Amino acid sequence: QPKPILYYDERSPPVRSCLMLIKLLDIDVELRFVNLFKGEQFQKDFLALNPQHSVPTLVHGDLVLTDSHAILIHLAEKFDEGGSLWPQEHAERMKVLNLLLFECSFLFRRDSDFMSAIVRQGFANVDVAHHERKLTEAYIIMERYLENSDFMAGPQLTLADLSIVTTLSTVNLMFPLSQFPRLRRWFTAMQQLDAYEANCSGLEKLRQTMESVGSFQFPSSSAVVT
Amino acid sequence: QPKPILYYDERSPPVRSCLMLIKLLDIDVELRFVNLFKGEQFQKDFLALNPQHSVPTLVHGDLVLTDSHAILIHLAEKFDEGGSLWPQEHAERMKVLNLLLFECSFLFRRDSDFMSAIVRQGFANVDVAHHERKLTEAYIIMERYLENSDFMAGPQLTLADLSIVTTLSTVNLMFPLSQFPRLRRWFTAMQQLDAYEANCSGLEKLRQTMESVGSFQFPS
Ligand SMILES: Cc1ccc(C(C)(C)C)cc1S(=O)(=O)Nc1ccccc1C(=O)O
Ligand SMILES: Cc1ccc(C(C)(C)C)cc1S(=O)(=O)Nc1ccccc1C(=O)O
Ligand SMILES: Cc1ccc(C(C)(C)C)cc1S(=O)(=O)Nc1ccccc1C(=O)O
Ligand SMILES: N[C@@H](CCC(=O)N[C@@H](CS)C(=O)NCC(=O)O)C(=O)O
Ligand SMILES: N[C@@H](CCC(=O)N[C@@H](CS)C(=O)NCC(=O)O)C(=O)O
Numbered sequence: 001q002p003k004p005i006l007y008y009d010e011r012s013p014p015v016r017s018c019l020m021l022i023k024l025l026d027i028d029v030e031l032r033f034v035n036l037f038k039g040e041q042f043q044k045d046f047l048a049l050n051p052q053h054s055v056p057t058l059v060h061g062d063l064v065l066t067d068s069h070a071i072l073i074h075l076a077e078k079f080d081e082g083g084s085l086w087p088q089e090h091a092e093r094m095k096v097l098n099l100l101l102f103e104c105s106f107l108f109r110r111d112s113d114f115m116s117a118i119v120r121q122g123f124a125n126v127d128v129a130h131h132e133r134k135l136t137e138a139y140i141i142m143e144r145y146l147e148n149s150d151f152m153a154g155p156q157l158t159l160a161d162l163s164i165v166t167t168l169s170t171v172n173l174m175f176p177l178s179q180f181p182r183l184r185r186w187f188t189a190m191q192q193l194d195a196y197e198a199n200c201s202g203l204e205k206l207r208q209t210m211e212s213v214g215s216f217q218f219p220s221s222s223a224v225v226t
Numbered sequence: 227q228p229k230p231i232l233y234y235d236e237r238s239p240p241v242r243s244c245l246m247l248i249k250l251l252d253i254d255v256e257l258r259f260v261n262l263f264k265g266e267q268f269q270k271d272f273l274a275l276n277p278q279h280s281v282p283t284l285v286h287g288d289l290v291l292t293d294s295h296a297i298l299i300h301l302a303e304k305f306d307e308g309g310s311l312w313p314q315e316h317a318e319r320m321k322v323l324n325l326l327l328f329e330c331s332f333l334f335r336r337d338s339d340f341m342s343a344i345v346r347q348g349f350a351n352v353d354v355a356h357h358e359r360k361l362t363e364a365y366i367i368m369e370r371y372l373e374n375s376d377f378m379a380g381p382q383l384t385l386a387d388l389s390i391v392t393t394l395s396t397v398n399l400m401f402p403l404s405q406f407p408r409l410r411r412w413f414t415a416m417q418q419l420d421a422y423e424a425n426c427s428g429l430e431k432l433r434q435t436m437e438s439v440g441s442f443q444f445p446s
Contacts, residue, residue, distance in 0.1 A: 051366070051367040051370050051371075052328065052332055052367060062317070063317055063320055063321075064324075065320060065324050066324055066327075066328070067324055067327035067328065067331060069323075069327055070320055070323045070324045070327055073320075073323065074316075074320050077316065090300075090303065091288070091289050094289055094291060094296055094299075094300050095289075097293075097295075097296045097299065098290075098291055098292055098293055098296045101292075101293035101295055101296055101330065102278065102292070102293065104327065104330050104331050105293060105330050105331075106278055109331075109335060140277070141277040141278060144277045145277070
């Protein structure tokens with residue numbers, strides 16, 4: 001019954017969500033670095049493990065998970081059994097699942113589109129206003145989700161907050177949260193959590209890498225700093 | 227308990243996955259059509275319900291689900307407790323979940339990218355070779371997933387097959403499966419399912435609407 005193995009590159013927001021859960025729950029996990037900027041995700045053995053050539057990838061015994069949201073759910077069920085991060089009551093759990101899928105299908109997709117365009121085209125050649133519209137629309141949606149509750153999926157911290165805060169912090173490197181009071185209040189609260197320390201290093205490394213590869217600077221005024 | 231309400235436009239592959247499960251499980255639902263090509267997902271009451279302005283959206287009592295994969299899991303858990311579609315064993319369930327997320331993050335994302343490019347740019351201006359690459363890569367991955375099993379997540383049909391097949395068939399409007407023996411056999415087998423009837427109307431409607439909006443004709 002070996003301990004979980006996490007193939008990771010901390011610059012990835014989804015990776016940082018798993019790192020946050022691992023810290024929060026004090027899970028002993030072996031970390032194996034896969035440098036996405038060097039193309040190590042295309043190494044023959046890693047491609048054999050995960051044809052999607054993506055991180056995070058978790059190997060836990062015979063189970064191989066290739067999506068951060070399955071990893072969060074699996075680790076919560078194995079190490080937060082009966083807990084509130086992945087709540088027990090069906091309706092509450094479905095709400096968390098719904099927000100995890102929002103992060104996958106909407107927030108991360110749009111941030112990935114924007115950041116991938118910077119890498120492929122160079123910042124100066126990206127239609128920044130187009131991506132500002134796409135990502136501001138995500139801000140609007142999250143502000144709507146927090147108008148009803150202090151956390152994304154209810155009155156208390158869940159996997160949904162861990163998944164969303166890492167990508168939110170990455171989007172906020174570029175786009176300010178000035179017009180989004182509930183989102184700012186939530187993001188500030190998330191930054192006070194001990195587990196949020198697992199987000200800081202990879203976010204800074206991503207900032208450095210993006211500014212280098214994209215030949216630009218994020219506006220220092222955008223990022224919320226607590 | 228009030229019956230579930232499904233807001234839908236059957237051109238949507240993820241909508242069609244939910245329609246297939248509803249047929250598979252004989253679920254009594256109220257369907258409410260939201261015409262995506264008239265922008266009805268932006269009607270004030272629907273945005274109020276789903277800020278993502280997306281279908282499928284399920285309202286089941288007080289629970290509002292805004293993603294097909296949550297809808298599939300929810301409906302399987304209410305209406306198919308003890309079935310093989312959403313297996314009870316943890317390892318098997320995680321495998322199904324992992325494949326559902328592949329459909330969302332990889333297969334559907336790339337098909338959505340391609341279809342979106344048609345609408346934004348016009349078919350005649352789409353870099354078809356680029357999207358043929360991204361999507362053939364998805365075919366390659368699914369062919370590998372099928373190495374050991376008859377179905378995407380194992381020896382039996384699961385929610386993962388329902389989610390993947392609808393998007394597959396949409397990709398297959400443009401890109402054939404002749405070079406993927408496992409994938410083609412799997413798709414043919416899926417097409418024999420009684421529940422696959424739920425995919426037929428929306429797939430044909432999507433082709434027809436895409437061809438007017440794209441001002442082209444799919445090679446199929
Ligand atoms: C952003 C990005 C672009 C391109 C790459 C390659 C080197 C693989 C081409 C890697 C990354 S990344 O390592 O920084 N990861 C992400 C981080 C934030 C948002 C999206 C992504 C993403 O990969 O889609
Ligand atoms: C409420 C409940 C009761 C019993 C079960 C078992 C069949 C495991 C006994 C599972 C659940 S559940 O609603 O809490 N389950 C998930 C939802 C989404 C994604 C994964 C799961 C999961 O069960 O792993
Ligand atoms: C019916 C319709 C109307 C309007 C839209 C826009 C949002 C593009 C204006 C999309 C659709 S659609 O339901 O046909 N859309 C997809 C179909 C197949 C694969 C992916 C998609 C997708 O929307 O990403
Ligand atoms: N939905 C997936 C997204 C995984 C993903 O796209 N990871 C990126 C980094 S953020 C990656 O590994 N890219 C490597 C590649 O695509 O080649 C998840 O939540 O894990
Ligand atoms: N991951 C989501 C994707 C939902 C989605 O993107 N639906 C499309 C149709 S395929 C839609 O409703 N588009 C309308 C819009 O975004 O305005 C799911 O599986 O439900």
